C-alpha cells in the first residue's frame, strides 16, 4: 500500500537521505566511544550506558566485540542493530578465511559490511541500521589500524576518532593532544581517560580494550577493573 | 501479498517511535519480578484475575522453555506466546546440533534477534512484550531481560510492567547477593504486593523457580505456603 509506505530510501529535494540523517541523530545520543592508534597497538574506550546498581555483568564486555583473531570493534547507536551487524562481521571474516585460508585484512571487513549498510539506503524500502562502529585490528598489509563506519555505509581510517555523545568535543581534544607517530599504548591510554573525563569519573562507567602483538600473534584484552582504577588515579594527579 | 516497507522508522530527533510505543504497552502490562539468588532464580507475576469465572490453571504466564530455562513477561499476552514458541524451537535446534542444553545467554541472544527483526522487517509492528528469562548452566544462575527492540540485559533483580519504577527501588533496598532461593521467593512476592491491592491468593499470582534441578512452576499449594 502506497498510503502507509514512509519511503525510507528516496532523495529529498536537496539530494539528502533523511533516514540516514535521522539515524546519525540517534548515534549522537548513544554512549561515548573512541579509538586511538599507537605505535605498539590500538585501543577502544567506551562509556558504559549500563551503570545501574542491580545489573549482573555476565559477559567479559558490553560494548566491545571480538570479530576474529586479529580484530575487535565497538558500537554507538541502536544496540539490537549492532548485534545484527557484529554477527554479520564474524560471518564475513569466517567466509574469507574459508576461501583464502588467511585472515581478512581489516579494510576488507569494513568494506564488506558497509556494502550491506549502503544497500539498505538504496533499495528494499527498509529503515537503515542506526549504528556507527569503530574497528581496531592488525593485518600483514598495514599493521595496526582503526576504522569508523556510519549508517550510510561510508567508512574512513583514523589515527584517533570518536563516535556517540559529545564526539565533537572529543575530536577537538584529540587534535590538540595526539602526537602523530609518537604515541605508545601507555600514553594513548592516558589520553583516552583525559578525553572521557571531559566528555562524560568511575571505573564502573568506562570500558577499555587493547589490541597488541605478542610473538607473531594478536592479543585482544579487556582491562580489568583494577587496571582501570589505577589509570583513573594516575590522571587526577595531572 | 504483504507490505515490504518498514513500519518502524527514525524520527527527526533520532527516535524509533514504534519501539517507544511498544514500551508503553509493556509499562501498561501486569507487574513481573525477577530475583537472582545465590543458588537459584525466581520469577513472579500478577494474574489479572478480573473474575472468579476464569480457570486460572488453563493458561500460564510463567512458562518452561527447556528443563533448565523458564520465562515470564510484561505486556501483551498473545505476543508472548509467539516468542515462547520461537524460544522453544530455538532451544531444540541448538540441542539437535550440539547435543547439549542451550546456555541461557545463547537462548536470550537468539530470541532478542527475533525481536529485532520485527523492528525492521516489512509490514509488521514490534512485539509489545518484555521478557524475563531465567536459567541454570555452568553451576550458576542467570536472569536476563529482553525488550521490544531486541536489547537484552543481565539483572541481579528487576521489575517490569505497571509501577516497575517503584518496584526497582524496593528491590534495591531488600536485595543482597548472599540471599538464598527460599528468601528470594519471599521478597519477590512482597515486591508484587507493593502494587497489587485485591487480596493476594495463590490463584492470582504465578511463581517459577530455577536451580540445579532445573526450572519448574511452583504448585498452587507451594505458593499458598509462601503467602
Amino acid at each position: 500500500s502506497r498510503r502507509y509506505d514512509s519511503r525510507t530510501t528516496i532523495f529529498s529535494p536537496e539530494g539528502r537521505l533523511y533516514q540516514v540523517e535521522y539515524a546519525m541523530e540517534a548515534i549522537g545520543h548513544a554512549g561515548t566511544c573512541l579509538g586511538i592508534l599507537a605505535n605498539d597497538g590500538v585501543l577502544l574506550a567506551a562509556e558504559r550506558r549500563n551503570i545501574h546498581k542491580l545489573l549482573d555483568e555476565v559477559f567479559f564486555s558490553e560494548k566491545i566485540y571480538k570479530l576474529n583473531e586479529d580484530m575487535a570493534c565497538s558500537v554507538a547507536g541502536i544496540t539490537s542493530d549492532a548485534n545484527v551487524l557484529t554477527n554479520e562481521l564474524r560471518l564475513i571474516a569466517q567466509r574469507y578465511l574459508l576461501q583464502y585460508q588467511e585472515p581478512i585484512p581489516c579494510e576488507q571487513l569494513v568494506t564488506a559490511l558497509c556494502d550491506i549498510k549502503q544497500a539498505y539506503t538504496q533499495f528494499g524500502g527498509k529503515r537503515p541500521f542506526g549504528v556507527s562502529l569503530l574497528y581496531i585490528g592488525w593485518d600483514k598489509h598495514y599493521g595496526f589500524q582503526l576504522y569508523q563506519s556510519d549508517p550510510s555505509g561510508n567508512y574512513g581510517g583514523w589515527k584517533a576518532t570518536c563516535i556517540g555523545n559529545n564526539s565533537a568535543a572529543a575530536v577537538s581534544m584529540l587534535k590538540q593532544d595526539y602526537k602523530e607517530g609518537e604515541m605508545t599504548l601507555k600514553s594513548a591510554l592516558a589520553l583516552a581517560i583525559k578525553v572521557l573525563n571531559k566528555t562524560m569519573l568511575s571505573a564502573e562507567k568506562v570500558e577499555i580494550a587493547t589490541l597488541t602483538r605478542e610473538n607473531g600473534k594478536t592479543v585482544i584484552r579487556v582491562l580489568k577493573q583494577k587496571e582501570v582504577e589505577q589509570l583513573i588515579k594516575k590522571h587526577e594527579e595531572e | 501479498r504483504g507490505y515490504s516497507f518498514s513500519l518502524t522508522t527514525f524520527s527527526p530527533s533520532g527516535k524509533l517511535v514504534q519501539i517507544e510505543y511498544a514500551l508503553a504497552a509493556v509499562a501498561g502490562g501486569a507487574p513481573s519480578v525477577g530475583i537472582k539468588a545465590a543458588n537459584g532464580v525466581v520469577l513472579a507475576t500478577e494474574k489479572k484475575q478480573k473474575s472468579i469465572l476464569y480457570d486460572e490453571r488453563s493458561v500460564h504466564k510463567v512458562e518452561p522453555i527447556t528443563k533448565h530455562i523458564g520465562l515470564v513477561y510484561s505486556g501483551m499476552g498473545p505476543d508472548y506466546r509467539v516468542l515462547v514458541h520461537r524460544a522453544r524451537k530455538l532451544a531444540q535446534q541448538y540441542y539437535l546440533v550440539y547435543q547439549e542444553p542451550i546456555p541461557t545467554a545463547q537462548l536470550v541472544q537468539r530470541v532478542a534477534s527475533v525481536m529485532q527483526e520485527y523492528t525492521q522487517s516489512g509490514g509488521v509492528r514490534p512485539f509489545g512484550v518484555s521478557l524475563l528469562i531465567c536459567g541454570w548452566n555452568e553451576g550458576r544462575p542467570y536472569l536476563f531481560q529482553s525488550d521490544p527492540s531486541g536489547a537484552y540485559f543481565a539483572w541481579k533483580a528487576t521489575a517490569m510492567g505497571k509501577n516497575y519504577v517503584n518496584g526497582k527501588t524496593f528491590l534495591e533496598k531488600r536485595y543482597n547477593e548472599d540471599l538464598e532461593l527460599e528468601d528470594a521467593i519471599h521478597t519477590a512476592i512482597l515486591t508484587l504486593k507493593e502494587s497489587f491491592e485485591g487480596q493476594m491468593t495463590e490463584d492470582n499470582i504465578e511463581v517459577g523457580i530455577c536451580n540445579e534441578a532445573g526450572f519448574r512452576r511452583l504448585t498452587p499449594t507451594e505458593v499458598k505456603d509462601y503467602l
Binding site: H29, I78 | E20, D147
Partner: peptide, 4 residues
C-alpha cells in the same frame, strides 16, 4: 532511551 534504554535501546541505545
Amino acid at each position: 532511551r534504554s535501546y541505545y
